[PDB]
Write an enzyme that holds these catalytic residues in place. Structure first.
Site, PDB file in Angstrom:
ATOM      1  CE1 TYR A  72      -3.627   2.532   0.046  1.00 28.72           C
ATOM      2  CE2 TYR A  72      -2.920   3.074   2.275  1.00 28.72           C
ATOM      3  CZ  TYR A  72      -3.705   3.346   1.163  1.00 28.72           C
ATOM      4  OH  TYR A  72      -4.512   4.452   1.146  1.00 28.72           O
ATOM      5  CG  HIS A 111      -7.282   5.146  -1.410  1.00 30.03           C
ATOM      6  ND1 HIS A 111      -6.641   4.189  -0.647  1.00 30.03           N
ATOM      7  CD2 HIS A 111      -8.564   4.760  -1.611  1.00 30.03           C
ATOM      8  CE1 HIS A 111      -7.555   3.271  -0.371  1.00 30.03           C
ATOM      9  NE2 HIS A 111      -8.732   3.578  -0.924  1.00 30.03           N
TER      10      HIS A 111
HETATM   11  C1  LIG Z   1       2.195  12.347  -9.352  1.00 36.53           C
HETATM   12  C2  LIG Z   1       3.618  12.809  -9.115  1.00 36.53           C
HETATM   13  C3  LIG Z   1       4.166  11.991  -7.949  1.00 36.53           C
HETATM   14  C4  LIG Z   1       4.426  12.470 -10.366  1.00 36.53           C
HETATM   15  O1  LIG Z   1       5.813  12.694 -10.102  1.00 36.53           O
HETATM   16  P1  LIG Z   1       6.842  13.441 -11.118  1.00 36.53           P
HETATM   17  O2  LIG Z   1       8.186  13.481 -10.438  1.00 36.53           O
HETATM   18  O3  LIG Z   1       6.333  14.685 -11.794  1.00 36.53           O
HETATM   19  O4  LIG Z   1       6.851  12.259 -12.241  1.00 36.53           O
HETATM   20  P2  LIG Z   1       7.867  11.898 -13.470  1.00 36.53           P
HETATM   21  O5  LIG Z   1       8.648  13.130 -13.860  1.00 36.53           O
HETATM   22  O6  LIG Z   1       8.558  10.657 -13.036  1.00 36.53           O
HETATM   23  O7  LIG Z   1       6.671  11.623 -14.538  1.00 36.53           O
HETATM   24  C5  LIG Z   1       6.509  10.313 -15.097  1.00 36.53           C
HETATM   25  C6  LIG Z   1       5.456  10.232 -16.197  1.00 36.53           C
HETATM   26  O8  LIG Z   1       4.117  10.315 -15.714  1.00 36.53           O
HETATM   27  C7  LIG Z   1       3.295  11.043 -16.634  1.00 36.53           C
HETATM   28  N1  LIG Z   1       2.830  12.296 -16.038  1.00 36.53           N
HETATM   29  C8  LIG Z   1       3.323  12.872 -14.897  1.00 36.53           C
HETATM   30  N2  LIG Z   1       2.833  14.070 -14.672  1.00 36.53           N
HETATM   31  C9  LIG Z   1       1.986  14.299 -15.723  1.00 36.53           C
HETATM   32  C10 LIG Z   1       1.184  15.382 -16.050  1.00 36.53           C
HETATM   33  N3  LIG Z   1       1.144  16.524 -15.240  1.00 36.53           N
HETATM   34  N4  LIG Z   1       0.452  15.318 -17.169  1.00 36.53           N
HETATM   35  C11 LIG Z   1       0.544  14.222 -17.930  1.00 36.53           C
HETATM   36  N5  LIG Z   1       1.278  13.124 -17.724  1.00 36.53           N
HETATM   37  C12 LIG Z   1       1.974  13.217 -16.587  1.00 36.53           C
HETATM   38  C13 LIG Z   1       4.183  11.318 -17.841  1.00 36.53           C
HETATM   39  O9  LIG Z   1       4.053  10.336 -18.864  1.00 36.53           O
HETATM   40  C14 LIG Z   1       5.567  11.333 -17.218  1.00 36.53           C
HETATM   41  O10 LIG Z   1       6.596  11.027 -18.146  1.00 36.53           O
HETATM   42  P3  LIG Z   1       7.274  12.280 -18.949  1.00 36.53           P
HETATM   43  O11 LIG Z   1       7.553  13.336 -17.894  1.00 36.53           O
HETATM   44  O12 LIG Z   1       8.492  11.634 -19.563  1.00 36.53           O
HETATM   45  O13 LIG Z   1       6.208  12.690 -19.953  1.00 36.53           O
HETATM   46  C15 LIG Z   1       3.692  14.328  -8.878  1.00 36.53           C
HETATM   47  O14 LIG Z   1       2.918  15.067  -9.813  1.00 36.53           O
HETATM   48  C16 LIG Z   1       3.341  14.836  -7.497  1.00 36.53           C
HETATM   49  O15 LIG Z   1       4.215  14.997  -6.669  1.00 36.53           O
HETATM   50  N6  LIG Z   1       2.023  15.148  -7.255  1.00 36.53           N
HETATM   51  C17 LIG Z   1       1.522  15.278  -5.897  1.00 36.53           C
HETATM   52  C18 LIG Z   1       1.532  13.928  -5.189  1.00 36.53           C
HETATM   53  C19 LIG Z   1       0.293  13.197  -5.547  1.00 36.53           C
HETATM   54  O16 LIG Z   1      -0.670  13.841  -5.900  1.00 36.53           O
HETATM   55  N7  LIG Z   1       0.298  11.816  -5.423  1.00 36.53           N
HETATM   56  C20 LIG Z   1      -0.918  11.181  -4.951  1.00 36.53           C
HETATM   57  C21 LIG Z   1      -0.833   9.680  -4.876  1.00 36.53           C
HETATM   58  S1  LIG Z   1       0.106   9.247  -3.383  1.00 36.53           S
HETATM   59  C1  LIG Z   2      -3.401   1.404   7.618  1.00 41.31           C
HETATM   60  N1  LIG Z   2      -3.381   2.743   7.078  1.00 41.31           N
HETATM   61  C2  LIG Z   2      -2.464   3.692   7.491  1.00 41.31           C
HETATM   62  O1  LIG Z   2      -1.610   3.530   8.351  1.00 41.31           O
HETATM   63  C3  LIG Z   2      -2.618   4.954   6.797  1.00 41.31           C
HETATM   64  C4  LIG Z   2      -2.083   6.145   7.242  1.00 41.31           C
HETATM   65  S1  LIG Z   2      -2.507   7.404   6.146  1.00 41.31           S
HETATM   66  C5  LIG Z   2      -3.341   6.260   5.184  1.00 41.31           C
HETATM   67  C6  LIG Z   2      -4.023   6.696   3.945  1.00 41.31           C
HETATM   68  C7  LIG Z   2      -3.051   6.935   2.810  1.00 41.31           C
HETATM   69  C8  LIG Z   2      -3.873   7.820   1.899  1.00 41.31           C
HETATM   70  N2  LIG Z   2      -3.083   8.488   0.886  1.00 41.31           N
HETATM   71  C9  LIG Z   2      -3.704   9.250  -0.072  1.00 41.31           C
HETATM   72  O2  LIG Z   2      -4.892   9.519  -0.037  1.00 41.31           O
HETATM   73  C10 LIG Z   2      -2.764   9.740  -1.148  1.00 41.31           C
HETATM   74  C11 LIG Z   2      -2.001  10.953  -0.678  1.00 41.31           C
HETATM   75  C12 LIG Z   2      -2.862  12.183  -0.553  1.00 41.31           C
HETATM   76  O3  LIG Z   2      -2.650  13.006   0.322  1.00 41.31           O
HETATM   77  N3  LIG Z   2      -3.870  12.269  -1.495  1.00 41.31           N
HETATM   78  C13 LIG Z   2      -4.795  13.394  -1.432  1.00 41.31           C
HETATM   79  C14 LIG Z   2      -4.017  11.383  -2.555  1.00 41.31           C
HETATM   80  O4  LIG Z   2      -4.530  11.718  -3.617  1.00 41.31           O
HETATM   81  N4  LIG Z   2      -3.536  10.104  -2.314  1.00 41.31           N
HETATM   82  C15 LIG Z   2      -4.509   8.767   2.899  1.00 41.31           C
HETATM   83  N5  LIG Z   2      -4.764   7.938   4.050  1.00 41.31           N
HETATM   84  C16 LIG Z   2      -5.884   8.015   4.879  1.00 41.31           C
HETATM   85  O5  LIG Z   2      -6.340   7.090   5.531  1.00 41.31           O
HETATM   86  C17 LIG Z   2      -6.543   9.311   5.026  1.00 41.31           C
HETATM   87  C18 LIG Z   2      -5.808  10.386   5.463  1.00 41.31           C
HETATM   88  C19 LIG Z   2      -6.435  11.601   5.603  1.00 41.31           C
HETATM   89  C20 LIG Z   2      -7.785  11.730   5.325  1.00 41.31           C
HETATM   90  C21 LIG Z   2      -8.437  13.051   5.473  1.00 41.31           C
HETATM   91  N6  LIG Z   2      -9.651  13.347   4.975  1.00 41.31           N
HETATM   92  N7  LIG Z   2      -9.823  14.662   5.250  1.00 41.31           N
HETATM   93  N8  LIG Z   2      -8.736  15.124   5.917  1.00 41.31           N
HETATM   94  N9  LIG Z   2      -7.848  14.109   6.063  1.00 41.31           N
HETATM   95  C22 LIG Z   2      -8.510  10.637   4.887  1.00 41.31           C
HETATM   96  C23 LIG Z   2      -7.887   9.420   4.736  1.00 41.31           C
HETATM   97  N10 LIG Z   2      -3.336   5.025   5.630  1.00 41.31           N
END
Ligand SMILES: CC(C)(COP(=O)(O)OP(=O)(O)OC[C@H]1O[C@@H](n2cnc3c(N)ncnc32)[C@H](O)[C@@H]1OP(=O)(O)O)[C@@H](O)C(=O)NCCC(=O)NCCS
Ligand SMILES: CNC(=O)c1csc([C@@H]2C[C@H](NC(=O)[C@@H]3CC(=O)N(C)C(=O)N3)CN2C(=O)c2ccc(-c3nnn[nH]3)cc2)n1
Length: 153
Positions: A72, A111
């Protein structure tokens, strides 16, 4: 070869830097327990450095649900001025590498808030699929909905 990106271990000495990075990057707060757990997951938590500057991090946990062994990803992010430099890919590849070297994980999942189009694009490029959309996953932020992204292993 010649990469400006390096991943490093998270330790008591730099956990404050990880906490700061998550504070700026993510719209939700992570409690003291999350950071305590992070110090104990070993290779499942890393800080990403760009030219030796801490610019992102990844925090994961082993999950045992749906009668499976699942990885996860809780948080994976990079500061906005350093995006699209391959920092996210380096962090995701690190965790995909652990999973491949271990061989006992069924899948990897996370998520993603439905408004995060760039994160959905990013994960889909690695073979993650939207397997579900959880309504009201978040409580204090909008949209409250989150897609569940999963890659099978
Ligand atoms: C999502 C995230 C982690 C991507 O990290 P990053 O360092 O920009 O990614 P990379 O440079 O390794 O991008 C890899 C590929 O993904 C795709 N991609 C990434 N960002 C993109 C964008 N804004 N639009 C379109 N494609 C995208 C592309 O294909 C890219 O390859 P390219 O740059 O060669 O075109 C970053 O945007 C981020 O930090 N966002 C906030 C964190 C988040 O929202 N994550 C939530 C889940 S935990
Ligand atoms: C056994 N589980 C654990 O130990 C554990 C620890 S945190 C976790 C998970 C991980 C999850 N990560 C994401 O959602 C990522 C990162 C990110 O920030 N976003 C927006 C995104 O797009 N993806 C958030 N989280 C929650 O449970 C969570 C956290 C905050 C809120 C909330 N709601 N309103 N205020 N706070 C709702 C849910 N699990």
């Amino acid at each position: 070869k010649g990469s400006r990106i390096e991943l490093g271990d998270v330790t008591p000495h730099n956990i404050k830097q990880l906490k700061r990075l998550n504070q700026v990057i993510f719209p939700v707060s992570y409690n003291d327990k999350f950071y305590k757990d992070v110090l104990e997951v070993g290779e499942l938590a890393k800080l990403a450095y760009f030219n030796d500057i801490a610019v992102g991090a990844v925090c994961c946990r082993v999950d045992h649900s749906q009668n499976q062994k699942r990885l996860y990803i809780m948080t994976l992010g990079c500061l906005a001025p350093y995006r699209r430099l391959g920092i996210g890919t380096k962090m995701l590849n690190h965790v995909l590498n652990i999973c491949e070297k271990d061989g006992t994980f069924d899948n990897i999942y996370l998520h993603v808030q439905i408004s995060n189009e760039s994160a959905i694009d990013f994960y889909r490029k690695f073979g993650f699929e939207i397997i579900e959309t959880k309504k009201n996953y978040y409580k204090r932020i909008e949209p409250a909905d989150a897609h569940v992204l999963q890659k099978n292993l």
